[PDB]
Design a protein around this ligand. Structure first.
Ligand SMILES: Cc1cc2nc3c(=O)[nH]c(=O)nc-3n(C[C@H](O)[C@H](O)[C@H](O)COP(=O)(O)OP(=O)(O)OC[C@H]3O[C@@H](n4cnc5c(N)ncnc54)[C@H](O)[C@@H]3O)c2cc1C
Ligand SMILES: Cc1cc2nc3c(=O)[nH]c(=O)nc-3n(C[C@H](O)[C@H](O)[C@H](O)COP(=O)(O)OP(=O)(O)OC[C@H]3O[C@@H](n4cnc5c(N)ncnc54)[C@H](O)[C@@H]3O)c2cc1C
Ligand SMILES: NC(=O)c1ccc[n+]([C@@H]2O[C@H](COP(=O)([O-])OP(=O)(O)OC[C@H]3O[C@@H](n4cnc5c(N)ncnc54)[C@H](OP(=O)(O)O)[C@@H]3O)[C@@H](O)[C@H]2O)c1
Ligand SMILES: NC(=O)c1ccc[n+]([C@@H]2O[C@H](COP(=O)([O-])OP(=O)(O)OC[C@H]3O[C@@H](n4cnc5c(N)ncnc54)[C@H](OP(=O)(O)O)[C@@H]3O)[C@@H](O)[C@H]2O)c1
Lengths: 316, 314
């Protein structure tokens, strides 16, 4: 037992995991939280969060997630910077192998979130790190006064197009429909930048291929979704924003899952975050594919902590 | 009669979070606050469990920021109270005081109110020694004698909130054992042998006693024998659980124990009630968690569910 043991272990440093840590510490569970590769979650990659209830104006992504780390730290939550790459749920206490050490727990809260999907194109993979990216705030400054493309039609794609609008010379938003599924006030901000700014729309278009030489992306080829006709577009980079895939690869074969999402009990009779393995609970984007908000992930993280407490108290 | 695409009943965490997300979706929400503006949180001194907030967060402080957040996105906040609804008609008609309302989609988040025993003497001494919220009336009984009726989470954790305020707390329960979280019974049981708590198991509050100035005692009755017993206390806290404020919905919405039934599940539309276009959020549909962060999460789902419904109308 060089393994680090604790009554409760929380995977993920996002809204779901940090909210679970607050409610777990206040229940005297002495929770241990594993942050992961991306400390703070997906919210640390956006600059505006105006739908966190209680913050009327001026809240940023990393600002809320630093406030949540302080909140969990203040209640003496052991925050460990590691990345779990292998788990074992056929033994109790559960065992999780990290890149630094190994951890053991009687109850586990899985809130590993989701990572950006990719189209899967051959040229898309070839130009990764050389023009193809999935985080506008990470690689946006590369393209100061240049033409960039953004593929997608959701909240992420519109925000990335609006963010790159203030850095790049032209932003070409590629979407396969003539309408977007982002928030309405984001569509209004998008359309204002289309009529008066440097955002060009390319509706009813799909990315057919990423083009470039040995020094990065020099353009993209689009395809008309109605006529099959192709056309070329000169850009220096391409940001893919076609959705997020839950981070559940290490749990495959040991948890019940559907389309990569961890299945939970749900329901109106409590124990809603319970997975197919008793004593293991899931919260956040790892088990939600319909809402996927910071406030919804935090609420589910609270349920997971309370469900974990009621499970621990049922043990002899 | 006023009309709007979306109507939100309640001004708590669930109702205000629904108003924010609905305003961001160009729905122009109208929010009826109810008689209690801000919800149950406006009756709490400190809130240390709202994620992302530093120390010193007060109940009314968080709900003032929520109202300002909703008002900032142009949410029409109407101080009213609904007392009659008609869900068989479409658009739904809601009859309140000084106004009647109409809407194509409705989000119900009217919260829950604490139960009372229903005794005649309990009714008279309300606010004069008899109350449910131990926070709003906890400073009255510093170094005095108080009684707490109940045997669950609400009663045990309120008996602990008074264990360091009052000189002694009499916990009155009708069963031999309790029914709270195991760590709440542990915080309670050591304060029975080493602290301020005195147990009155297998007892029922028979009558609240006192004069025209306040509670001077309570009479307990043995649930086994029927013989009574008198106690001397300056206050009596009734903590027998909460009741979802859904009396005006009986008959028109599928309910269980007063709580509005929703679809739940993992395939979206989780807040959909038994009437398409009507959605529930917060303590009216949750009897397992009853948290502010949980209610705010459901209010967001109710707004996203209502937006999909209103969008499907064309
Ligand atoms: C660009 C962008 C902008 C957004 N803006 C908003 C907004 O304004 N408002 C809003 O409500 N929502 C917004 N969202 C959505 C929001 O980010 C999610 O709802 C939320 O971040 C999900 O919370 P979570 O804790 O469930 O997952 P995440 O926040 O993604 O947390 C995942 C955590 O799990 C850890 N992890 C993953 N795998 C492992 C492993 N194998 N081992 C150990 N740890 C691991 C990671 O390190 C990470 O910290 C936005 C999303 C994006 C991408
Ligand atoms: C004393 C006390 C302390 C608490 N402390 C905490 C804490 O520290 N942390 C925490 O997370 N939770 C706490 N809670 C619980 C928390 O407040 C609730 O879970 C949460 O506020 C409920 O959210 P809600 O918006 O669904 O309902 P509420 O917040 O109760 O809001 C209900 C609203 O609906 C309105 N309404 C009611 N009936 C009608 C009607 N007929 N017509 C129109 N409007 C109506 C009312 O005006 C009210 O504003 C506490 C509760 C109490 C009683
Ligand atoms: N400010 C905020 O509140 C905020 C900000 C960001 C994210 N979020 C939330 O976080 C979640 C993340 O959503 P997201 O915007 O990242 O993705 P999403 O909402 O799932 O939408 C992805 C977009 O990409 C398109 N797409 C998907 N697969 C594609 C493919 N193979 N080829 C071409 N186009 C494809 C989809 O078009 P179709 O519509 O045609 O499928 C869709 O419009 C969302 O649920 C959102 O609500 C919220
Ligand atoms: N903050 C929260 O709300 C929270 C937090 C964690 C967990 N929970 C869960 O939610 C539940 C909350 O319990 P609660 O105490 O709020 O409500 P509850 O479960 O209904 O318990 C009420 C208690 O009061 C007694 N009681 C009820 N009606 C009575 C009457 N008319 N006269 C005398 N006594 C009466 C009951 O005794 P009997 O046992 O004899 O019925 C019961 O012990 C818990 O079971 C817990 O699992 C809630």
């Amino acid at each position: 037992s060089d393994m680090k043991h604790s009554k409760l272990l929380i995977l993920g440093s996002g809204p779901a995991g940090y909210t679970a840590a607050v409610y777990a510490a206040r229940a005297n569970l002495n929770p241990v939280l594993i942050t992961g590769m991306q400390q703070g979650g997906q919210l640390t990659t956006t600059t505006e969060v105006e739908n966190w209830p209680g913050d009327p104006e001026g809240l940023t992504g990393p600002g809320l997630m630093d406030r949540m780390k302080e909140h969990a730290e203040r209640f003496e939550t052991e925050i460990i910077f590691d990345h779990i790459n292998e788990v074992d749920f056929s033994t109790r206490p559960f065992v999780l192998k990290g890149d630094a050490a190994s951890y053991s727990c009687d109850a586990l809260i899985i809130s590993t979130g989701a990572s950006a999907k990719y189209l899967g194109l051959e040229s898309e993979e070839a130009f990764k790190g050389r023009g193809v990216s999935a985080c506008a705030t990470c690689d946006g400054f590369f393209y100061r006064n240049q033409k960039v493309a953004v593929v997608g039609g959701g909240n992420t794609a519109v925000e990335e197009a609006l963010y790159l609008s203030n850095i790049a010379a032209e932003v070409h938003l590629i979407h396969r429909r003539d309408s977007f599924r982002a928030e309405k006030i984001l569509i209004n901000r998008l359309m204002d930048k289309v009529q008066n700014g440097n955002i060009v729309l390319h509706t009813d278009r799909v990315l057919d291929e990423v083009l470039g030489d040995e020094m990065g992306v020099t353009g993209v080829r689009l395809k008309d979704v109605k006529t099959g006709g192709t056309e070329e577009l000169d850009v220096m980079g391409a940001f893919i924003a076609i959705g997020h895939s839950p981070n559940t690869q290490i749990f495959q074969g040991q948890l019940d899952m559907k389309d990569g999402y961890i299945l939970v009990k749900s329901g109106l009779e409590g124990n809603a975050t319970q997975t197919s393995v008793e004593g293991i609970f899931a919260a956040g984007d790892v088990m939600d594919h319909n809402y996927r908000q910071a406030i919804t992930s935090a609420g589910t993280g609270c349920m997971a902590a309370l469900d974990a407490e009621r499970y621990l108290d049922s043990l002899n």
